[PDB]
Structure 1
């Protein structure tokens, strides 16, 4: 028998209880800081939410600390909601966050470490003039929140954004200040969309063109572009554009307002929400934290007594062609790798299933690369308007085609009665150009009742003719982060097979199509647990 079969081994998550929106991430004095929305009283959202706190020297192995920001003054008596962190000149970190005041309205609060001597910033103090910012003119007291990391303009003035809506038209309210205490709403929003509802946890940063690293938020230039990100309709979206401080104007690259349609871009197309990035000036990389909600019954959450996991921190950067963003787990994860199992030049005959042996199947890192031959045989399906989620949900692992479904069977039982399939499908349009679809077929992930087993999918932007379809998977018990094409298309999935209570998990590579495919290379590593020390009291 096995207890707590769903807690992860190397993904960040508190000892117990509920967690969501990751908060004010930052790198201060050689230490990585992470904060998270926490309900110290149950395994479900509640009327009282504080800021969880934990530190790490490598984003992998953590140390849980006492909660940092909790309601102490009127400006946040009901709860301390999401916010961001900004290290101001002088090496002093500032925390701006949304609070729920006595009158139950959402406002912006400021706070900062109280004992900078302390490597772990255990104790924090609020400013006295809190709240620093209150809902604008025509804005409802529960539609104004999630302030961003601030950025300093060449003119010496700061800039931040706050989420919310104006008559149900999601917006990025922009405020400016010189001291970081007195703020004034700017005349227009930084950006916005219609009928999208409250924009949550906005994020606005610069990405260096033709590079693969990050920049300090405050950077700007002609060889730089800006990502305007926002959550809404249960998903986090973004858009690459150009920023011009002089008029606080954001001009999208594709020239579209966010729509939440299969027309826009998301970081991850599965369970991924309330994401926030931050600049790591030690390794020159922009890191991305994101909340991964549960998919099992609320009843189930109260039983296991915990909800919420954080994605494994991924590095962010704009693509070579500059039209989309790329993500990849930070190198530190590599140090968790134990033993390995390879495969090279292995054909997967039509309708076959090859098992990977010797790996720690339930907690591993698996990369696999397919070599396609005979594309002319691709099914015929113009994909200009097709919605991939519908397609993976209609054509699962058991729907045989020409090229694909071919891929990986993770968190699977020995009898394949329960399985989670991450795979591909290659299609071709009348004119002869190809398209690749990536899927996460959770339809058979678990036999348990009351579990959301919806599947997730997205189209991968590569050329099957020239490049091989690559796929890495971070398998950690109840979460699977599927990285396709080197991070050009990511998909996080939560699954809860029943077998994980008695039997051990299995790992397979498979091809259920009619056309033969070959495994160019398959590198699989068993992943050891991440160290989680506790220093609270």
Structure 2
């Protein structure tokens, strides 16, 4: 009997209890700070939520500290909900977050460290005039929250967006300020969308064109595009566009308003929510954090004593084509790599399963690249309006095609009674144009009852004719993060196989299609544990 088989070895999570939204991520004086919605009293959401706090020098190894922000004033007496960090000139980190006041309404509060001499910024002081911002005229008391990191315009005026909705229409309410204390709502929202519901944890930032670097939030210009991100209808959506400080205008590149449909982009197509990014000027990259909810039952959570994980932090940038974002785990993760097992020029015949020996199958970093033959044999299927997730749930690893399913079997039992299959399928429309589907088939990830085993999928924007299909998987016990085509398509999965309680996991490569596929190259590394030190009480 293995203890806590579902706890991860290198993903961030508190010692125990419930954790959701990542809060105020930032880099300050050489230290990476991470905060998060935390329930000090249970492994479920609760009436009292506070900001947990941890610090790190590399985003991999962490030191758990005492919570940083917890109810101490009327403006946040019932709870301290999500917010973001902005480092103001003069080198002072300012935290804006949504507090639940004594009247149970959502208001925006300000706090900043009380002891800048402390490398870990443990103590925080709250502004005497909180709340700084209260719900606009026609907005309900519980539909106004999650202030973003602020950006300073060329006119010396600060901007921030706060999420909410006006009559069920998602809103990114824009506020302005020069002293960061007195804020005035701009006449029009920065962006919005009809019937989406409250926009949660909005994020607004620039990305450099033709570059894999990150930018400080306040950069603007012609060689820069902006990303408007918001969570609603259960997922995190984003759209790339152009921002004009002058008129506070955000113009979507594709001219669409978010609808939460297969028409819009997401950072990740699996369990991924309340994502928040920050600029890291030490490495000149933008890092993205995201809450990964549990998919087991609440009773299971209370039983194991904890709930919620954070995705492994990923660098973020805009693709060469400028039509979507690219994500990739921060390079620091590579330091966890131990022994390596590699394969090259290996054919995977139809219906075959190849086991990868010598790897810690429950805690690994696996990359594989497939070279295809006989593309003309791809099943004919126009995918213009097809819902990729629906398609993966309809056709799992057991549904045999021509090109596909071929990919990986992770967190699998020796007898394959339980397995999580991450794979691809290749289709072509009537005109001979190819499309690529990436799937995380979780239908057989566990034999346990009361586990949400819904599968996830998304189309990958690559040309199978000229580029091999690559896949990287971060396997860490109850979480699997899959990156297709170098980060073009990401899918995070939560799995709870029963076998992990008594036996070891296995890793396989497979091809259940009728066409042959070749592994041009595969690299697998056992990953050692990240260190988590407690410096509390």
Provide TM-score, normalisation by structure 2. Answer: 1.00
Q: State the partner residue of 2:444.
A: 444
Return the offset for 1:99.
Answer: 0.3
Deviation at 1:216? 0.3
Once residues 329 and 213 of structure 2 are traced to their aligned partners in structure 1, the CA distance between those partners, rounded to angstroms, is: 13
- Offset from partner CA, 1:461-501 (integer Å, 9 cap, x none): 00000000000000000000000000000000000000000
The aligned counterpart of 1:527 is 527
CA shift at 1:335, angstroms?
Answer: 0.1
Structural RMSD (CA): 0.3
How many angstroms does 1:504 deviate by?
0.3
**How much has 1:406 moved relative to structure 2?**
0.3
Aligned equivalent of 2:432: 432
**Equivalent in the alignment of 1:175:** 175
Per-residue deviation at 1:303? Answer: 0.1
How far the C-alpha of 1:522 sits from its partner, in A, is: 0.3
CA distance in 2, matches of 1:70, 1:456: 36
SS of the counterpart of 2:186? Answer: strand
Give secondary structure in 2 for the equivalent of 1:140: coil
SS of residue matched to 1:66: strand
Asked if 1:66 corresponds to 2:66, the answer is yes
Per the TM alignment, residue 405 of structure 1 is displaced from its structure 2 partner at its CA by: 0.2
3-state SS in 2 of match to 1:393:
helix
Secondary structure in 2 matching 1:302: helix
Deviation at 1:240, TM superposition (A): 0.2
* Structure 1 residues 198-250: Cα deviation after superposition (integer angstroms, max 9, x where no partner): 00000000000000010000000000000000000000000000000000000
Counterpart-to-counterpart distance in 2, 1:18 and 1:502: 26
- Give secondary structure in 2 for the equivalent of 1:229: strand
Q: Distance in 2 between matches of 1:248 and 1:158?
A: 12
What's the counterpart of residue 46 of structure 1? 46
Could you tell me which residue of structure 1 aligns to residue 391 of structure 2? 391
Name the structure 2 match of 1:404. 404
Q: Deviations over 1:424-473 (max 9, x none)?
A: 00000000010000000000000000000000000000000000000000
- CA deviations on 1:338-379 (whole Å, 9 max, x unpaired) are 000000000000000000000000100000000001100000
- Aligned counterpart, 2:313: 313
Q: CA deviation at 1:67?
A: 0.1
Report the 3-state secondary structure (helix = DSSP H, G, I; strand = E; otherwise coil) of the residue aligned with 2:148. Answer: coil
User: Deviations for 1:28-65, whole angstroms, at most 9, x for unmatched residues?
Assistant: 00000000000000000000000000000000000000
Q: Distance in 2 between matches of 1:139 and 1:354?
A: 57
SS at match of 2:219: coil
Aligned length: 537
- Whether 1:349 aligns to 2:338 is no
SS across alignment from 1:187: coil
Distance 2:8 2:266 in 1: 24
Q: CA deviation at 1:113?
A: 0.2
Q: 2:13, 2:201 → 1: CA distance?
A: 20
Q: Deviations over 1:264-298 (max 9, x none)?
A: 00000000000000000000000000000000010
Query: How far has the Cα of 1:124 moved from its partner?
Result: 0.3
Query: How far 1:251 moved relative to its partner?
Result: 0.3
For residues 88-122 of structure 1, the C-alpha deviation after alignment (integer angstroms, 9 at most, x for no partner) is 00000000000000000000000000000000000
Q: SS at 1:216's partner residue?
A: coil
State the shift of 1:25 in Å: 0.2
1:49 and 1:501 map into 2 onto residues whose CA distance is: 31
- Aligned equivalents of 1:161, 1:408: Cα separation in 2: 41
Tell me, in whole angstroms, the C-alpha distance in 1 between the residues paired with 2:277 and 2:501.
Answer: 36
Q: Name the CA distance, whole Å, in 2 between partners of 1:32 and 1:435.
A: 40
- Would you say 1:247 and 2:247 are equivalent positions? yes
Flag structure 2 segments of 5+ consecutive residues without an equivalent.
Answer: none
Distance 2:368 2:121 in 1: 42
The whole-number CA distance in structure 2 between the counterparts of 1:223 and 1:486 is 23
CA deviation after TM superposition for structure 1 residue 256, in Å: 0.2
Match of 1:223 in 2: 223
TM-score, normalised with respect to structure 1: 1.00
User: Residues of 1 paired with 2:350 and 2:127: CA distance?
Assistant: 66
**1:422 aligns to 2:407 (yes or no):** no
Q: Equivalents in 2 of 1:500, 1:509: separation in Å?
A: 20
CA deviations 1:382-414 (Å, max 9, x no partner) are 000000000000000000000000000000000
Please list the CA deviations of residues 156-192 of structure 1 after superposition, one character each: whole Å capped at 9, or x if unmatched.
0000000000000000000000000000000000000
Residue 530 of structure 1, CA deviation: 0.4
Q: Secondary structure at the match of 1:135?
A: coil
